[PDB]
């Protein structure tokens, strides 16, 4: 299992250097089942709220992208009700060069702003450009009302 051999080593560096606003950890000794704790990056409209992320590392890893699912209900411009985010880095475009450490920052940075070029819900895009005000106050409320 290439995934287990590679990830074992990557645990020492990541735990020694927990990136800001993005952290995680293993479950027991297994690698195919992990959890992560993500914190709303400072200045984000979801800032403050803490989101638990379901992260699964497949044995086929790294030839397939990591499995990501949100276990916290978040109104995001990239994620649907099932908590799955589909970004090229999390798709076939994935490459073995990227590691479990980078994804958090890519996800963490992605939370700050939408990618309306390929959005998963069109209502935001109209609200995102026309009147973002409705999209923020309510976005503030959701994190304030759920993640708090």
């Amino acid at each position: 299992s290439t995934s287990a051999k590679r990830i074992q080593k990557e645990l020492a560096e990541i735990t020694l250097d927990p990136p800001p606003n993005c952290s995680a950890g293993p479950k027991g000794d297994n690698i195919y089942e992990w959890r992560s704790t993500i914190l709303g990056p400072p200045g984000s409209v979801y800032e403050g709220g803490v989101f638990f992320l379901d992260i699964t590392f497949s044995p086929d890893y790294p030839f397939k992208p990591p499995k990501v699912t949100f276990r916290t209900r978040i109104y995001h411009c990239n994620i649907n009700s099932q908590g799955v985010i589909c970004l090229d880095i999390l798709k076939d475009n994935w490459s073995p060069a990227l590691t479990i450490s980078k994804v958090l920052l890519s996800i963490c940075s992605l939370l700050t702003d939408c990618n309306p070029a390929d959005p998963l819900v069109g209502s935001i895009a109209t609200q995102y450009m026309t009147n973002r005000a409705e999209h923020d106050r309510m976005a503030r409320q959701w994190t304030k009302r759920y993640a708090t």
């Binding site: 950890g25 027991g28 803490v50 916290t72 209900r73 708090t148």
Partner: protein, 508 residues
């Protein structure tokens, strides 16, 4: 010993001095050392009903008929309505012998004290009233009872009906689901004030374990659905929905999502459970060490499956929930081996104020230093006279003796002393003859059978005052009147319903 033990001294001293301000309450309470139930009657005949309890004000007595479908309301006539019959009888006992006189009173004693007023039938769809379920409102105007009806084996209930959340429990074979209903009945008239229904749950009506009333706020814990329903009791005795705690913490949570995402179908964890997860996370963040980080994620799965088991209201807006393993809550495993997490939650603000492990010494310090606030008994009297580890020195001493006895297991001691918590609503009686300040005895006899007669010793002098025996010269239940000198001792053997009345007789 003060020479004031006689009633006369107390009566004369009361006519010249009312005492220091605020002491007059204890001026009268000492009379209970002069007036007590010194006389006992064995094996009194009674209707084929099930006796339940007195009302907090001690005016009404409730019993359940043998069909567990109607509530019997009896009015207490006083502990002085059977003195005419007993004239000429001496001693501390009255054997159920053969003399016609004793038979005449035994067949007449029960009706002398208790007068039938109403018999209200509430269950109408196969439901059966729970014998151990009973609650009285703060004003004492209304009583609350619950009826349960086992569901049929087939057809099996719908999956979307039996399971309404990701954290729902899996029903066990021995205790299949039931359809519950709660009724509020006015004691004065017997009218059925209002009734609410619950479908496909598992609520422990017995001993009010799944229920708790604080003033006018009522809480119901649905173990099957891991959901809490909160109702407000109006003066009329009509239920009003307050809010529901569970998958959502705010009453408007469903409304907002419905418009955006109209929708077991949702993998997001419960709003409440998320807050408990946040607290265990933020606390683990303070340590910073890899160990604390190591443990948090290692047991995340085990912790995420924790399920509610009990609850109780610390105030009108705080809940003291207890959490335990999914297996234990279904009565398959012993809890002590499983860590139980106590949680304090604010209903309006919606944050977890505190979380205490089972071995949390901080919680134990709170319990013994605030046992009065946890018990929340005798709430129906503005001037309460609580007896507990935090209200009487002698009550505290027993608490230390139990703990010291176990140590001479520190951890195991903490384990069992918290087994009673959370407490069941309206489980304690404000009987002055049970007050430790006035009288002395061993709390073990009344809260396996105690073969010895219970003896009550006055604390001022240490002298015996009266004895209580609940058998014919094996479960024993006592029911003291809230204040007056009257007590019922019921001895159960197989199917025998033995009743003895303890009342004050002026030995002539």
């Amino acid at each position: 010993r003060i020479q004031n033990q006689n009633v006369i001294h107390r009566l004369e001293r009361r006519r010249i001095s009312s005492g220091k301000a605020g002491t007059h309450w204890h001026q009268v309470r000492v009379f209970h050392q002069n007036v007590f139930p010194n006389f006992t009657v064995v094996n009194v005949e009674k209707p084929p009903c099930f006796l339940r309890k007195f009302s907090p004000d001690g005016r009404y007595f409730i019993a359940f008929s043998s069909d567990q479908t109607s509530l019997e309301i009896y009015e207490y006539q006083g502990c002085q309505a059977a003195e005419d019959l007993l004239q000429g009888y001496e001693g501390e006992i009255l054997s159920n012998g053969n003399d016609q006189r004793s038979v005449n009173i035994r067949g007449r004693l029960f009706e002398r004290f208790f007068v039938l007023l109403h018999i209200t039938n509430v269950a109408a769809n196969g439901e059966h009233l729970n014998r151990e379920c009973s609650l009285f409102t703060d004003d004492c105007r209304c009583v609350i009872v619950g009826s349960a009806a086992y569901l049929p084996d087939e057809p099996h209930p719908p999956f979307f009906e039996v399971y309404r959340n990701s954290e729902s429990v899996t029903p066990n074979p021995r205790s299949p689901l039931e359809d519950y209903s709660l009724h509020i009945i006015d004691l004065h008239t017997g009218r059925l004030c209002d009734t609410r229904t619950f479908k496909c749950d598992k609520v422990v009506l017995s001993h009010n374990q799944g229920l708790y009333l604080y003033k006018n706020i009522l809480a119901i814990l649905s173990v099957q659905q891991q959901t809490i329903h909160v109702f407000q009791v109006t003066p009329e005795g009509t239920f009003i929905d307050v809010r529901t705690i569970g998958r959502f913490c705010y009453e408007d949570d469903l409304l907002t999502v419905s418009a955006v995402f109209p929708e077991f179908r949702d993998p997001f964890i419960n709003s409440l459970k998320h807050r408990l997860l946040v607290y265990l996370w933020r606390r683990a963040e303070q340590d910073g060490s890899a160990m604390a980080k190591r443990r948090f994620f290692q047991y995340f799965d085990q912790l995420r499956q924790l399920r509610m088991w009990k609850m109780q209201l610390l105030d009108e807006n705080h809940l003291f929930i207890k959490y335990t393993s999914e297996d234990v809550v279904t009565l398959r495993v012993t809890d002590p081996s499983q860590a139980s997490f106590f949680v304090v939650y604010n209903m309006v603000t919606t944050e977890v104020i505190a979380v205490f492990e089972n071995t949390s010494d901080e919680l134990l310090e709170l319990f013994e230093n605030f046992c009065d606030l946890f018990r929340n008994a005798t709430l129906h009297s503005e001037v309460q006279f609580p007896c507990s580890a935090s209200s009487n020195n002698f009550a505290r001493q027993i608490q230390r003796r139990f703990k010291d006895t176990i140590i001479n297991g520190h951890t195991e001691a903490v384990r069992r002393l918290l087994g009673q918590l959370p407490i069941s609503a309206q489980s304690y009686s404000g009987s002055p003859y049970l007050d430790l300040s006035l009288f002395s005895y061993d709390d073990k006899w009344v809260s396996t059978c105690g073969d010895h007669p219970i003896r009550f010793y006055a604390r001022d002098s240490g002298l015996l005052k009266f004895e209580i025996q609940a058998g014919l010269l094996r479960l024993v239940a006592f029911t003291f009147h809230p204040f007056e000198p009257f007590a019922i001792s019921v001895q159960r053997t197989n199917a025998e319903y033995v009743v003895n009345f303890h009342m004050r007789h002026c030995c002539t």
